[PDB]
Amino acid sequence: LGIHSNDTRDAWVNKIAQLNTLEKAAEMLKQFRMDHTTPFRNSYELDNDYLWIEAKLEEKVAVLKARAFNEVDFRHKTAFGEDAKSVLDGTVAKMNAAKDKWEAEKIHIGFRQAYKPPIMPVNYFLDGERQLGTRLMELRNLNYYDTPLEELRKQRGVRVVHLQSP
C-alpha cells in the first residue's frame, strides 16, 4: 500500500469505471487536470499519484471518444466537440500577441490543461506545442539574468520562507 499500488489509486480506478459517457469522462479529465496538474494545480493532495491517475482517465476518455466519434471527427474534433484546427490556430494567435513571458506562460500551461489528448487530437496538440513552446521560450530567454533574484521572487509571487548565504 504505497508507491505503485495504494488505496487512493484503487479508489480512482473504481471512480473511472463508473464513467460511461464521453461527455462525463471528458469533463472529469479536464477537471482533474485543473485540480492536480502543473504548478497551478488547485492542490497538491494527490502529488504522488496524479500522473498515474490522469493517464487511467485518458484511457477511459480515449476508448469512449473512439466508440462515439467518426473517422473524420476523431481526427479533427476534440472530445468536447470543438474543432481542433480552430483552437490550435486561435491559441497561437493569443501567444504571438502575448505582451510578455508572464502572459505567454499562462496561455501555454493553460493550453495543456484543457487540450491534452484524448481531448484534442495528438496531431494538432503537438503542433501547437511546437509553436506555443517556441514563443514562450523566446520571451523567457530574453535577458534571462537581468532581473535580480530578490525581484524575481516577487514577480513569481512566491512566499519566501527561509534564506541563508554565508
Binding site: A55, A66, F111, R112, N123, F125, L126, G133
Partner: protein, 388 residues
Amino acid sequence: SMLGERRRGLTDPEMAAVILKALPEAPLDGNNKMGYFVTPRWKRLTEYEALTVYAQPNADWIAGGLDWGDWTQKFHGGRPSWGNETTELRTVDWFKHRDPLRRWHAPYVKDKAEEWRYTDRFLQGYSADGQIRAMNPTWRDEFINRYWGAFLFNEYGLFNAHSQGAREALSDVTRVSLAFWGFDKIDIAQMIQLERGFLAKIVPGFDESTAVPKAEWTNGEVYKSARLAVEGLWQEVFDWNESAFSVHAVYDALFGQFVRREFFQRLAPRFGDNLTPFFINQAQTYFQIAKQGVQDLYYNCLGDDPEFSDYNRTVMRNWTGKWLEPTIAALRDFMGLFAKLPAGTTDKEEITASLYRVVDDWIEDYASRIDFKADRDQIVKAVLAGLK
C-alpha cells in the same frame, strides 16, 4: 619502456594480491542473469531482451514503466520528456514489443556490414566480367537514371519520416526497431544512388548527378502524387505511431512494394539489367525484415492488446483509410510510366496480375489483421484508371 609505466590490477603482483585478498569465497548472489525479472517472449530470455528491455527510464504512469515520479526536467510549458500524449494508441505495456529478428545494435551492423562488403566485391566482379554489355542503353539512361533514381527521394522521405518517432517512441524495444526501419530506408536511398554512381564509372557519358532524378521527383508527373504522400507522412503527422504504421503497413506496402518489386524487379531483367536487381534484392530483404517488426508491434501487441484491442484497431482502421487514398493516388500517377516503355515491354494483362499481387499481399499481411475490410477489385480498378 617494454613494460610500460602503468601498473594494472589484473597483472601487477602487489595490486592483484590486495584485490585477491578482498574477494569473498563465492559470489554474493547466485543469480548471475541480467534482466532476470524480464518476461521472456520465447523459451528462455534472449541476449536481445536482456540488453534492451527497460533501458528506457519510464515511470509507472506510462504503461509498462517501472520507475516512479515525474521527470526531473521538462519542456517550457510542461510537456513531459516522454508521455502518453504523443500518440493516440494506448496499451497495457509499451515494453511488450519484440523484434522477431531480435536485433540489437551489434547483430544489426554485423548483417549490414556483410552486405556492404559483398556489395563491393560484386561491383568489382560485375565491372570486370563486362556484364554491362548485355544492358539496354534506353533502360540504363532513362528508366534507371531517371525513374529509379528519383525513387530514392521517396525512400529518403520515408527515412526522415522516422525522425519524430526516434525521439518520441515510448519504449526501448520500439525505439530500436523504429530506428532500424528508418536506417534501412536511407540505406536503400543511398544504394539507389550508389548504382548511378557505379554506372557513371563504367558508362562514358553517364551523369551521376541527382539533378535529373531530383527534377523528376520535384516537378515530374510520374511520382508527383507519391511525393505528396511522402510530405504528408513526414511533415504533417506528429504522432510517431501513425507515422510508422501508415508508412509501413499502408504506403510502402502498396506503393513501395509495387514500384520496387512489381516494376523494376520484374522488368529490369528484360532489358539485360541484373545490376539494379542486385540492389532491389537488398531493399526487399530489408522490407521483409521491417515487416515482421511492424506486424509484432501494431497487431500482436497493440491490435490484440488485452485491454485496448478494439480501441487500437479502430484507430489503425481509421489511419488505414486516411492514407489508403493518397496511396491509391500515388499509384495512379505512377502508372503513367508504363506509357514511356517501348512497345512490347509489357501489357495490361500483366500490370493487372502484378497489382493484384501487391494488393492481395497487402490485404493478407496488414488489412485483415485490423479487420479493415477492403475491396481488391475496386482498388486495382482505381489505380488502373491511371493507364494511358
